[PDB]
Amino acid sequence: HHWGYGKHNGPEHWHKDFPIAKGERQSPVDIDTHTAKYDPSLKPLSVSYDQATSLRILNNGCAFNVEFDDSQDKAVLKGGPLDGTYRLIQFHFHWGSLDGQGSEHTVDKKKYAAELHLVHWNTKYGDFGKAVQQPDGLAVLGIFLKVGSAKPGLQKVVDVLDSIKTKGKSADFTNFDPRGLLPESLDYWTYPGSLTTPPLLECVTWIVLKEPISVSSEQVLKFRKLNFNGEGEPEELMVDNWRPAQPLKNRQIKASF
Numbered sequence: 001h002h003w004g005y006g007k008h009n010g011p012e013h014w015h016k017d018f019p020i021a022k023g024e025r026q027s028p029v030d031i032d033t034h035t036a037k038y039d040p041s042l043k044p045l046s047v048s049y050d051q052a053t054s055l056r057i058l059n060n061g062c063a064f065n066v067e068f069d070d071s072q073d074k075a076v077l078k079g080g081p082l083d084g085t086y087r088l089i090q091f092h093f094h095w096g097s098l099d100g101q102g103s104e105h106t107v108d109k110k111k112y113a114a115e116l117h118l119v120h121w122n123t124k125y126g127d128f129g130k131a132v133q134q135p136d137g138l139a140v141l142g143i144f145l146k147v148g149s150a151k152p153g154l155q156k157v158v159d160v161l162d163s164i165k166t167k168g169k170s171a172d173f174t175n176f177d178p179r180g181l182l183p184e185s186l187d188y189w190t191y192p193g194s195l196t197t198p199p200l201l202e203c204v205t206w207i208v209l210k211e212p213i214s215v216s217s218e219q220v221l222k223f224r225k226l227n228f229n230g231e232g233e234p235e236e237l238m239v240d241n242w243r244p245a246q247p248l249k250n251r252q253i254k255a256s257f
């Protein structure tokens with residue numbers, strides 16, 4: 001794909017091939033905590049990951065995806081703003097070249113060192129590619145990363161990056177438990193938005209957790225050793241793969257707390 005994160009193919013250029021980039025419900029956005037409103041109508045959030053079945057980790061040239069078996073209801077997200085059930089298909093991260101940047105969402109303009117996206121699709125639509133064509137097709141659980149204490153549940157991921165350094169490399173990644181990536185609190189903000197990479201489809205109910213997880217400097221440093229390029233090509237570090245905040249336009253961010 002032509003698009004990327006650089007001066008010549010980055011976020012400011014995406015609109016020429018994906019005009020929806022200048023659309024009415026684009027992501028990420030800045031979350032202004034003073035204007036987000038508590039919504040008592042929100043039902044309790046349900047993150048049911050006990051039977052999660054991970055498969056593989058892939059360096060796709062832009063980030064790395066950990067993929068799950070979504071053939072059945074094994075890891076699902078329910079409740080909150082959501083109706084019906086949403087199946088986990090993959091997670092990935094966005095991160096920075098420095099600790100003061102890397103997240104996509106911001107909180108009162110605050111940028112975190114990274115941001116985890118747990119991507120889920122609405123089972124009523126039967127497969128992922130159909131769901132992304134629906135305004136309520138996806139639900140993405142967003143979790144901020146700050147640098148501090150190591151996150152033990154992340155270390156298996158960090159441990160395998162060595163084996164997928166370059167674009168197109170994949171590795172077995174079975175028996176990984178995403179519950180180890182969750183903070184204590186499931187207090188969130190929610191708004192309707194989009195994929196944050198091309199094709200930028202406006203199909204996501206965003207659920208962004210208030211509580212960040214802490215990871216260590218050594219953990220984040222290993223993220224930054226990945227490569228955008230393919231094997232045997234000149235090295236370009238995989239850093240700053242985040243889209244900046246987009247205009248909120250006619251949307252309201254709701255708080256669960």
Ligand SMILES: *SCCNC(=O)c1ccccc1
Pocket residue numbers: 003004005006061062063228229230236
């Ligand atoms: S989403 C990132 C897409 N790939 C690149 O922008 C790139 C730049 C330089 C070397 C390899 C790949």
Ligand SMILES: [Zn+2]
Pocket residue numbers: 092093094117196
């Ligand atoms: Zn993402």
